[PDB]
Amino acid sequence: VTSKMDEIQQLQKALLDYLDENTETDPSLVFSRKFYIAQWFRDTTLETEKKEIETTGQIMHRAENRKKFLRSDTVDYDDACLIVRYLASMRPFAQSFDIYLTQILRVLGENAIAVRTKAMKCLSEVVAVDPSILARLDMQRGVHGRLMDNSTSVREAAVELLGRFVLCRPQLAEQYYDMLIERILDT
Amino acid sequence: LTEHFIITLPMLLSKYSADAEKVANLLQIPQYFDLEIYSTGRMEKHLDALLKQIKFVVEKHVESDVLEACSKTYSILCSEEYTIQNRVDIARSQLIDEFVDRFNHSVEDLLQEGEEADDDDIYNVLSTLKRLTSFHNAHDL
């Protein structure tokens, strides 16, 4: 939330020149260079796996990789930061968070108290980092269920979540106020 | 200040090496460095660039103040509480071999009949002697 708001091969070339200069500046950078090389190699093969059109494309790709490894201007630091951020944002990691969330909701129905308590508490932390996530209907029904759950621990965790979320975003809190202030008499 | 000028100073010396006043001003900069940062920053190559460029600067100017400043900078750099000392002291020893060899030429030329005390030889000996006095002021030779 604080970051986002054939050319790819040319970018790979540019990053290689950046690191190449930094080899002169400081040792151990050669290891990083070889590591990036291997990672590009395996990523092209793994996308290849999913054909003859991309077969010819990847054989020029991979041959260029072999050549360019054998081959061991003016681009600098911030540029390198933004390029590698972009190329990482292409990788199958930045679009993983969503998946992770789903996993968490599998936990909420379980047969052990402590795990559910801690899950709810960490979720409270999660939402209090990014306040615009109480939109997906499944999480809504989750926090409702846990508000009606049959154990005092998860009950206090849930009410703490809902209260901190209400406190953070000043307006738009009159929609949770009723379900909140119902809960005072909870034994 | 340290992180900035470790990168920037060699380029400055390269840019303005002909101007004595500018280098004389710039030489006051290293007197204030936290010297740990050469170690913790992994930046010893820029130190090598500094010593090479400053060497060339020493070789191109003869006004006394720059020599005083450069000598004092080496004195700060040869502080024996920091790990960096040995490299700069060795490079300094290479400089002192250079200085003594010119001194050897100076003593042989004056002692012999030579060119009958020509002004040009006298100027060479005087310039070299000035460099020797300036460095010798701060360091045990």
Swiss-Prot record, chain A:
It is found in: Nucleus; Chromosome. Transmembrane segments: none annotated. It comes from the Eukaryota. Widely expressed. Highly expressed in heart, skeletal muscle, fetal and adult liver, fetal and adult kidney. Expressed at intermediates level in thymus, placenta, peripheral leukocyte and small intestine. Weakly or not expressed in brain, colon, spleen and lung. Changing E7K: In a breast cancer sample; somatic mutation. HEAT repeats lie at residues 94-132. It is linked to Cornelia de Lange syndrome 1: A form of Cornelia de Lange syndrome, a clinically heterogeneous developmental disorder associated with malformations affecting multiple systems. Characterized by facial dysmorphisms, abnormal hands and feet, growth delay, cognitive retardation, hirsutism, gastroesophageal dysfunction and cardiac, ophthalmologic and genitourinary anomalies. Belongs to the SCC2/Nipped-B family. Heterodimerizes with MAU2/SCC4 to form the cohesin loading complex. The NIPBL-MAU2 heterodimer interacts with the cohesin complex composed of SMC1A/B and SMC3 heterodimer, RAD21 and STAG1/SA1. NIPBL directly contacts all members of the complex, RAD21, SMC1A/B, SMC3 and STAG1. Interacts directly (via PxVxL motif) with CBX5. Interacts with ZNF609 (via N-terminus). Interacts with the multiprotein complex Integrator. Interacts (via PxVxL motif) with CBX3. Interacts with BRD4. Contains one Pro-Xaa-Val-Xaa-Leu (PxVxL) motif, which is required for interaction with chromoshadow domains. This motif requires additional residues -7, -6, +4 and +5 of the central Val which contact the chromoshadow domain. Plays an important role in the loading of the cohesin complex on to DNA. Forms a heterodimeric complex (also known as cohesin loading complex) with MAU2/SCC4 which mediates the loading of the cohesin complex onto chromatin. Plays a role in cohesin loading at sites of DNA damage. Its recruitment to double-strand breaks (DSBs) sites occurs in a CBX3-, RNF8- and RNF168-dependent manner whereas its recruitment to UV irradiation-induced DNA damage sites occurs in a ATM-, ATR-, RNF8- and RNF168-dependent manner. This is Nipped-B-like protein. The chain holds residues 1625 to 1860 of 2804 of the full protein.
Curated annotation (Swiss-Prot), chain B:
It is found in: Nucleus; Chromosome; Chromosome, Centromere. Transmembrane segments: none annotated. Phosphorylated by PLK1. The large dissociation of cohesin from chromosome arms during prophase is partly due to its phosphorylation. It comes from the Eukaryota. It is linked to Intellectual developmental disorder, autosomal dominant 47: A disorder characterized by significantly below average general intellectual functioning associated with impairments in adaptive behavior and manifested during the developmental period. MRD47 patients manifest developmental delay and mild to moderate intellectual disability, usually with delayed speech. Component of cohesin complex, a complex required for the cohesion of sister chromatids after DNA replication. The cohesin complex apparently forms a large proteinaceous ring within which sister chromatids can be trapped. At anaphase, the complex is cleaved and dissociates from chromatin, allowing sister chromatids to segregate. The cohesin complex may also play a role in spindle pole assembly during mitosis. Belongs to the SCC3 family. Cohesin complexes are composed of a heterodimer between a SMC1 protein (SMC1A or SMC1B) and SMC3, which are attached via their hinge domain, and RAD21 which link them at their heads, and one STAG protein (STAG1, STAG2 or STAG3). In cohesin complexes, STAG1 is mutually exclusive with STAG2 and STAG3. Interacts directly with RAD21 in cohesin complex. The cohesin complex interacts with the cohesin loading complex subunits NIPBL/Scc2 (via HEAT repeats) and MAU2/Scc4. NIPBL directly contacts all members of the complex, RAD21, SMC1A/B, SMC3 and STAG1. This is Cohesin subunit SA-1. It comes from Homo sapiens. The lineage of its organism: Eukaryota, Metazoa, Chordata, Craniata, Vertebrata. The chain holds residues 567 to 707 of 1258 of the full protein.
